[PDB]
Amino acid sequence: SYDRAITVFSPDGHLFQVEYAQEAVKKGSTAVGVRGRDIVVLGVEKKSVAKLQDERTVRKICALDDNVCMAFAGLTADARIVINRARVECQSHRLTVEDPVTVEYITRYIASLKQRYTQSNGRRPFGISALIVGFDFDGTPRLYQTDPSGTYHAWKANAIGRGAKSVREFLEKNYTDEAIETDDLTIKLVIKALLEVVQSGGKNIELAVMRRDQSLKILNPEEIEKYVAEIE
Amino acid sequence: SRRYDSRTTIFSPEGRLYQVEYAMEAIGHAGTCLGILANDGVLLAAERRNIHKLLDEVFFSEKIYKLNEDMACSVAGITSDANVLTNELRLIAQRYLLQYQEPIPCEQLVTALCDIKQAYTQFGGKRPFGVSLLYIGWDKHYGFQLYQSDPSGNYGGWKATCIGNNSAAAVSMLKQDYKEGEMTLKSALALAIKVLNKTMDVSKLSAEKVEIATLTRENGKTVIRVLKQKEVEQLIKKHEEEEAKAE
Amino acid sequence: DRGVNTFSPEGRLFQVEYAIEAIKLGSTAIGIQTSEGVCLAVEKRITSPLMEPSSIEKIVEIDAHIGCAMSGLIADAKTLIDKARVETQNHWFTYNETMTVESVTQAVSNLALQFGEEDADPGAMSRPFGVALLFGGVDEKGPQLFHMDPSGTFVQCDARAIGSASEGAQSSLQEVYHKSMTLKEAIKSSLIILKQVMEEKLNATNIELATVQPGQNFHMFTKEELEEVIKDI
Amino acid sequence: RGSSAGFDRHITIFSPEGRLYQVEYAFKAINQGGLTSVAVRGKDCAVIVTQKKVPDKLLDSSTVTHLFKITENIGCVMTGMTADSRSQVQRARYEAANWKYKYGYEIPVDMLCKRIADISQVYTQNAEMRPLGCCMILIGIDEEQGPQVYKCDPAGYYCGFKATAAGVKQTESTSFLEKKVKKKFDWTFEQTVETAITCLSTVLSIDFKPSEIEVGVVTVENPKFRILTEAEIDAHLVAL
Amino acid sequence: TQNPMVTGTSVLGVKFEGGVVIAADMLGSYGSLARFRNISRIMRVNNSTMLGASGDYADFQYLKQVLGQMVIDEELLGDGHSYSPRAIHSWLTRAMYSRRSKMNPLWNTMVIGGYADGESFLGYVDMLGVAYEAPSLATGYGAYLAQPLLREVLEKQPVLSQTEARDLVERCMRVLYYRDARSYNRFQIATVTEKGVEIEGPLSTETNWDIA
Amino acid sequence: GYDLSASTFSPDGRVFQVEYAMKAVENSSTAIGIRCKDGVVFGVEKLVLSKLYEEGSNKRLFNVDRHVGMAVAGLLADARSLADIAREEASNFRSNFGYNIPLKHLADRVAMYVHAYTLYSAVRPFGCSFMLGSYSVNDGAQLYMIDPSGVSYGYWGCAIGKARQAAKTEIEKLQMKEMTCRDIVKEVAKIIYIVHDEVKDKAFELELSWVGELTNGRHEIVPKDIREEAEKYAKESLK
Amino acid sequence: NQYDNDVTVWSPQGRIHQIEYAMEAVKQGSATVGLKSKTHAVLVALKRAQSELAAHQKKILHVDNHIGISIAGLTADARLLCNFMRQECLDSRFVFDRPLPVSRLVSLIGSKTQIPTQRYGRRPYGVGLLIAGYDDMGPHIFQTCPSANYFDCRAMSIGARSQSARTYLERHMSEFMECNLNELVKHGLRALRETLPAEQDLTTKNVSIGIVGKDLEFTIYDDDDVSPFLEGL
Amino acid sequence: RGYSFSLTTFSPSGKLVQIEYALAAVAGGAPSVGIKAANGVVLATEKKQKSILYDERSVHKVEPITKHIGLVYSGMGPDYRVLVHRARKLAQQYYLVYQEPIPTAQLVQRVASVMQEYTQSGGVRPFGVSLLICGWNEGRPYLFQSDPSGAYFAWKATAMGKNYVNGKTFLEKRYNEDLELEDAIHTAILTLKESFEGQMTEDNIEVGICNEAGFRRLTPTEVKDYLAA
């Protein structure tokens, strides 16, 4: 077994491997999502489509459970380990509890997993950040954000990836009770935020909406163009 | 000992993995290999590295290493680092057929190795595999598929892609002459030879410097057949003669 | 260059020495031990208006009669508060009694300074904890308020302030504190010093406070209960 | 000449020329003892001779020896760090004993050196451990091959010898005795003890006394390794 | 030990004023057979503590090398602290209890005498870990054939002398010779006093008289 | 940087971590021993730093078995571990083989325990030099000394401490082969005081022990009656 | 320069810097004093003030009924070693049903403390302990240091500015054995008083006094119980 | 306890330096020349002792794995031995499971996998030895070359050791696919003559052949008979 400390303390109380793990988050694709009333929306910005891609497996929006899904930004490899192991916890929690997983439960499990590899021997922290949405048993929407350091926080709106500092300021002033009222206006709030961080033009993005009844069905490229034409 | 450790699994100040980024440049000098997703089948065109005349033929292929009856791969990278990967791929694919009594879906076997290739990019302090190898095959759901697995641990679907030497100039050619859904098998064999010309410094192709394997469905059974020397030379003579008619 | 276990020329053990400096990057947490109870006040440090303040817990439930305030990295203290909740249940399970605050802080602080990269265990901690926890509650000896340093040194404190503003905040505690003060004065005296050390505007949203009475159990004030104390300051 | 880059100066790995920059210094560590061992085999016998130097009068002559008995029919002589010497001898006695318990018969000199050479090789390939700073010379009487003299080094090279030299004078004692490769067997018989003595006394110009060295032999008539008493060494020293 | 092989017979004991004395005959027993009669089942632990055992003699040699060697280890550093007779009785009771927990018990049945701090100590250690302190002790069949005679004298006279307790042991040992098949004629007598443990040579029961 | 690891040889083929380990022995006070015809006599110069230390503190004479003594020169920390390991080496022998351990075997088992830590970078060589001595009917008296490198040689007498050469000149002319144990005890104290420096190290406590036939093969600390006789006889020759 | 990063690396002078840097941490700690008479052994220590409102510390821990210690060093490493001492003393009464001799308990410390020193990736214990216990041989002051070696002392003082206390102990060291129980503690009080600045004095709250004896087991005296001892000072 | 971190890492230029420097130890070793003929494969290496005191009958640079398989090396002596003794173990582990003589191509893949394991797992350096592996299976000759990285290549004829570049070009001219085992032995000896610098004799080289009768090394008496031509 390889036992060594990769993440160690530094002068002025800093963690190099943890801070540089967050640098890989800002080097990935931009993922933006918001929390509405009965609706939650997730979306990502693809860097280059090129029309050689198979759009099914390159999706950055995964589903941890029927009521819980997540979208990340960062190294694509570091994400797949998180999604796969979180789906195991969602199934193991249904075994003992006999109830669907709460959105904060799987968020703490992922945050503690991102935390564990920071203080573990011979293990590097994740280079990803996760945006998790879902609905509890009472039907309340939830939006959470996890960091490579292991901290998790709820959000009304959040943005991760490159250019997230400009999108977060865009979502801060434009978020209100009017835009989060209608289900269609909530979807357009993410697209309007994604178009600001995409310098290419048009819609290269990928967006998925998860409601309560009939969970999540990801929107096709033709369906996302209808909202982009209405906001033009 | 910390003095002797090279810190392979750490992060760079810019957010990069050193041993992962340096393993990509080993692939840029590695053997040129490409693949094309068509309607009735998928092919693998790989430029042979060692053309040396005193080299003999051992078993069935060179860089191919067929992983199963329903799917095959092609490797570009350190010649040794590809062997352990192909062995583990044959282990994962057969444990599925052992456990589920079904042929392995091409999407599942790629995900399994990319977790093993990632395991050395995170914990253990070892070096990552310097081989990025492609995937071809057929399943009962999405049919023919083509994958590309990087040493970083990430993969993705591809209609047309190339790995190895001159991969950047090869993908650019596959962005134009390729048509989604309109490419058949025989049209893909001609497109593979067209790319292997401009992407290789040689004046032409003698058919001993390339190896092509096709995967098609025959009578409900997936067959993997590597094109022989006489079958590849017919493709080269077809493209060399057609190039004179276009100018 | 060097490992996690090393002694300085002065014997300061840099890893914990640098872990204490990580506390100076965290939010301010203040608490007071009175004869009628203990209080724990901590700053949330809201980063953005889109951040939900209800999801920031720097004060968590250890036992029914015990509560703790946190500072620094929120993550590193999550594994310590989890072992505390297990330790309080392991004592009540075996001995059928409420676990004293002295043994709770002592057991959690045992995880401090215990780390290594050489043959520690199958799992191990690569670095100590860069967090400072203020433990509080009412035990058989009365209300007790304790602190836990990254060096594993726990100290009984009547009033102690931690976090980035800890310097200059402790000087404000020693002036206004006396042994005869009540709990209602402790909640009011806490927010006054918080008003000085907090950069943004102090309101019921960005402050988090909880108290432990001898008669009652650990309880955290809601949004409506914090509005009454702020108007009194 | 030889390039040096990276950690080559500390842990054993490939030099830019692939010379094992670190392994080559285990041979120089043998010369740190300042001693020379001369081993030579005849037709019916094999002889080992090394230098015995007492630095202080308080030393006990019987306790300080470089000749060790691995088994009944196999002798030994060591040149190198004496601390590394006793470690390799105990491993040879433990390895030769596992042979008899597992395989039923006494171990030949052929495969007693290879296993120790394989052990010393493990020190060369692993970076966490240094090679031994001494070399082992093992002698004995094989059933089919008769007398055998082999030497393993820190690099793991056990290849055979018609005669073996080691130590600081190894280079001088090898070329001098190489001229004794002339006549077939160099008059090989019981008096080959003097063959090793005159080679050791020539390079050091010492003209050793009876107790100045220590000698041991293996023979066909007496397969057991015997350490010659200083009274018996004086008989051969007075004849030359 | 699942089943014993070479077994011993009753070992007596009594505490008098000034020390403790026990006695055991020298005989081996395998399947109702006298095999090794030269074996000595009475062990001298150290100066202030003496020991004797019934039961398996092979397991007793293990207790000879494990317990006797610990005495040397305590005397290596030599700070002036020595094992008291009740401390060895405690360590030995712990070793006997740890064996039955793993289901590998020691068939030995032991009696530990000693004199320390001006107080005579006597103790009993069995196979199952039963331990206590009684003025008189007899193991095996000695509990049936001897201890009744031991308690009879000690009930009227709780404190004995060195010569009177010696006649008590020799008279109870002679009774063991008559009705016990595992008994034997020659027997060892060891006595701990302020001068230490002294193990006397062989004594014969041949003074016995059989009237038929 | 060849000296930063015990597994790294120098360009001249030397291991400094082993060589710097024996330099700590030169920073420790002198401890000597003498093997005579009737047994083995030990002595140690024990430097007490502050007068607050109790007499007998930091004992330099250890008994690894009843018939074998031990005398150390070096870091006192590594001296007590090697004493316990030498106890375990003699402990496992009497358990398996059932008889007292020959000091030829005991010194060889401990010398390899010391050398086993000189071949790896994960451990450090011991910084103390220690000597062994014993007496037996068949085997007689034996004295060996183990260096920090793990090498063991036989000695009639040996000197390890601050001054190594100064005490050897006094022992070589002693002619110990014809002298009994009681005559050596008076001579050992004479050698301890002559190599002592009245300038640098002031306070000291003489630690002496022997083993031989008069103890019937047993090693013990010198009684006060004999020790007082040897110290007074040694100060008389010091002048 | 490069020899101080590892404990297993010897310096050119035949010296280990890492062990000596651990002995620097015990001198940067708090001054602790202890001494023995022919009857009782007493430990007197300064409880350090981290702030004005905080109960200082507890630097004296209970090991066994007949054994007690005083902490100078890293506090978390003290109880980590003390828990082994508590387990070692309970080991004897469990197995041997006798009090474990103080001289043998300290010998087990030197063997355990040495193991981190010789192995790579581990650090020596950076806490010294003044151990007071009553065995069959009388009181025992046996000292433990970051270096695995131990010393038997009649009187000893460690921690910050302990040299001024050793000067007081070395002068009166002849009369310690003739002192009674009440007057014996007063020597440790005046010895510990020399460890304070001219602006500081010995109070009841900052002083804890351990005592062990023949007919009296090891007991600690709190701020209220140290008043009779400070009445003559 | 051993090092768990890999000593071989990717250079900034995208190469493995410990394997690249391992080829330098192979290039400085003794020349070994394999040739695959129609009915058999011959392995000819240069065995040169630094002095006349060394025993030529003690160690054999050409050693058999099984009766039908043998292999020769160009490079360090010791790093070949632990490598070749494990090849003998991996060959019989096949014979235990399958009760069949191990194929040559199957034996090379298992040995090359072990040579790869030490180029990846930590605490171990790569091998400085390259292999020329021959064998007779299924009525076909086999000649393979194992690189220190763990890569294998099927060769009709090749050469390694000192002056391998000038030696390899010497084989391609005089090599023919219709050559027999007797004709391939002389061509393998002539390559060892390309760089010698001295007078070569029967004890100055080591040669062995693998035919349908199995693998065996040529005795010094049989080597002298081939040197007269």
Numbering used by the authors:
A (entry chain D): 2 to 233
B (entry chain C): 2 to 248
C (entry chain E): 9 to 241
D (entry chain A): 3 to 242
E (entry chain N): 1 to 212
F (entry chain G): 6 to 244
G (entry chain F): 4 to 236
H (entry chain B): 3 to 231
Paper's wording?
The 26S proteasome holoenzyme consists of a 19S regulatory particle (RP; a.k.a. proteasome activator 700), which is responsible for recognizing the ubiquitin signal and unfolding the target protein, and a 20S core particle (CP), which hydrolyzes the unfolded polypeptide into short peptides of varying lengths. Three of the seven β subunits in each of the two β-rings that align this proteolytic chamber (β1, β2, and β5) are proteolytically active, and between them hydrolyze most substrate peptide bonds to generate a variety of short peptide products. We show that 20S proteasomes can degrade the ubiquitin tag along with the conjugated substrate.
In order to better understand how a ubiquitin conjugate enters the proteolytic chamber of the 20S complex, we performed cryo-EM single-particle analysis on purified human 20S proteasomes before and after incubation with MonoUb-Cyclin B1-NT. A similar analysis of substrate-incubated 20S complexes resulted in five classes, with one class (S1) comprising 29.1% of the particles in an asymmetric appearance. 62.9% of the particles appeared symmetric, closed at both α-rings similar to the 20S only structure, and could be refined into a map denoted as S2. S2 may represent the particles not directly or obviously affected by substrate.
